[PDB]
């Protein structure tokens, strides 16, 4: 777990998929999911070594997780530590959106930080940490009681 409530991001590289400005509010947004029931407090930053640096990657791109194309795996995430520790990676040979087309970047992201911030997954399919990919309306979104569970348990 981190042993500290500031914590900085850093969008390394912008999908194609998707506007600037959307990546930057859905990676925001999802953050604050994760604010909204800790002490956390999280910042983009744009120059130097954040804490979780977040990346659009394809195949083999330098960790030992390399991605598998369109499907399948979408993202993957580090727990928390130093160097790639919190790390959050999305495949790039996804079609990153907004909305349902594709495959929903704030959704995802909101799972992949839970991982950046110590969460495993879940066996429930409520859960925003269950592995599997669904839309749910992005307005419509709530973290489980079992998300904010595990999460208070890590961090409240
Ligand atoms: O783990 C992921 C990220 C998607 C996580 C699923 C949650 C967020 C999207 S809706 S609920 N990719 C590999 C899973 C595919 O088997
Ligand atoms: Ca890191
Ligand atoms: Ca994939
Ligand atoms: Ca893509
Ligand atoms: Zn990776
Ligand atoms: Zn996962």
Not at 62 to 83: Q, V, W
């Amino acid at each position: 777990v981190w042993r500290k409530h500031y914590i900085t991001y850093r969008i390394n590289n912008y999908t194609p998929d998707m506007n600037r400005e959307d990546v930057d509010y859905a990676i925001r947004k999802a953050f604050q999911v994760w604010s909204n029931v800790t002490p956390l407090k999280f910042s983009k930053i744009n120059t130097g070594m954040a804490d979780i640096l977040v990346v659009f990657a394809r195949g083999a791109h330098g960790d030992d997780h390399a991605f598998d194309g369109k499907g399948g795996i979408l993202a993957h995430a580090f727990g928390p530590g130093s160097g790639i520790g919190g790390d959050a990676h999305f495949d790039e040979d996804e079609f990153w959106t907004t909305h349902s087309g594709g495959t929903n970047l704030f959704l995802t992201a909101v799972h992949e930080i839970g991982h950046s911030l110590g969460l495993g997954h879940s066996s429930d399919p409520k859960a925003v940490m269950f592995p599997t990919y669904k839309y749910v309306d992005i307005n419509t979104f709530r973290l489980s009681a079992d998300d904010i569970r595990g999460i208070q348990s890590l961090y409240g």
